[PDB]
């Protein structure tokens, strides 16, 4: 048969980075797509997983194996062993600020590769329990991407889909 690659790429709304949605993809598969950097397999002709998230424009560099940053370490981590990204400025950027997308700024330990964390627990930095009250040494784990269409080229939102082939 053919592959529903058209239902992840051309999807209505992608999920936020921290809650990166994964879709399992029997078919053989042959836009601007700014970065079509591929690491896992050489570009030449059992299952594959499609991970779709929304990250800041410049953060596309962080979605690579052996890369160290907030996105990779905390939000979405890739194992050391293709990636497609397009700019969604006119699609996912509200003038008053599209705070719908969130990223994980505070985490005790780095994320395991392909691990997924949807926790909303207050980062307990100090030795006093935060009991659901944000204050000193008690900071919310997630921050909101300020997404305005008038943002710079870097800060414009870029829809990204990750393909992870599994034989």
């Amino acid at each position, epitope marked *: 048969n053919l592959c529903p690659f058209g239902e992840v790429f051309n999807a209505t709304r992608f999920a936020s980075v921290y809650a990166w949605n994964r879709k399992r993809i029997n078919c053989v598969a042959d836009a601007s797509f700014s970065t079509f950097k591929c690491y896992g397999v050489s570009p030449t002709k059992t299952n594959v997983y499609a991970d779709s998230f929304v990250i800041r424009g410049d953060e596309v560099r962080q979605i690579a194996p052996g890369q160290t940053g907030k996105i990779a370490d905390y939000n979405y981590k890739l194992p050391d062993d293709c990636v497609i990204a397009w700019n969604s400025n006119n699609l996912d950027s509200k003038v008053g600020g599209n705070y719908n997308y969130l990223y994980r700024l*505070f985490r005790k330990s780095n994320l395991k590769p392909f691990e997924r964390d949807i926790s909303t627990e207050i980062y307990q930095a100090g030795s006093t329990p935060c009991n659901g009250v944000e204050g*000193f040494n008690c900071y*919310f784990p997630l921050q909101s991407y300020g997404f305005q269409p008038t943002n710079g080229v870097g800060y414009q939102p870029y829809r990204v889909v990750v393909l992870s082939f599994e034989l």
Partner: antibody
Amino acid sequence: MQLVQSGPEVKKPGTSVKVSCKASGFTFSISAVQWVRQARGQRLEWIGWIVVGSGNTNYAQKFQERVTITRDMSTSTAYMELSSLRFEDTAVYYCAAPYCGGDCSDGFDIWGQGTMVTVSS
Amino acid sequence: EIVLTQSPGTLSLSPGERATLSCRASQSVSSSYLAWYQQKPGQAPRLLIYGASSRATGIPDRFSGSGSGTDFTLTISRLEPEDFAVYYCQQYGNSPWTFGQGTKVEI
């Protein structure tokens, strides 16, 4: 481990002064910088505090318009700028942060030397 | 707003005498967020007690902190020559964070 504040500052009324507090020795990421001002032989006054990691800022209503507290993780330096300087704003300004090496120590244990901003026509 | 009232204004005692300084608040403050600071003449403050009762690292054993709710007290059992300074009490629980007028330790 220490916090090193900026050198003494001499500014005119109506300008804006920026005092730099640079963190060294402790993991500045999960820390939080608090700015306190003290005039000669007078009680301490608290401007505001910033979560270094999140960047979220909370200001006392006194300096709401007049100050902006920022930080730069590349230089491990926190900044506090007081705008529309008045003669009465002349005082030493202190920078306080918690030694948050592993666990954040639950207390402002690091205080800077202070910066002396003198405002006069 | 939290009001931090310190008593007394000027406290004068001889070395080897117990110093009982008190810090009072308007509305109860979280006991985990009540610090005491020591201010030397022309020096940056150094935190004595954090958490209203836990002593800081590198602080002599003579300094001890107590109190909960609206009342907090700092106790110095063995006053020393270097122990003469002003003592400020700050709360970092509820916004805005406030500082006391400070109590002076004299001879």
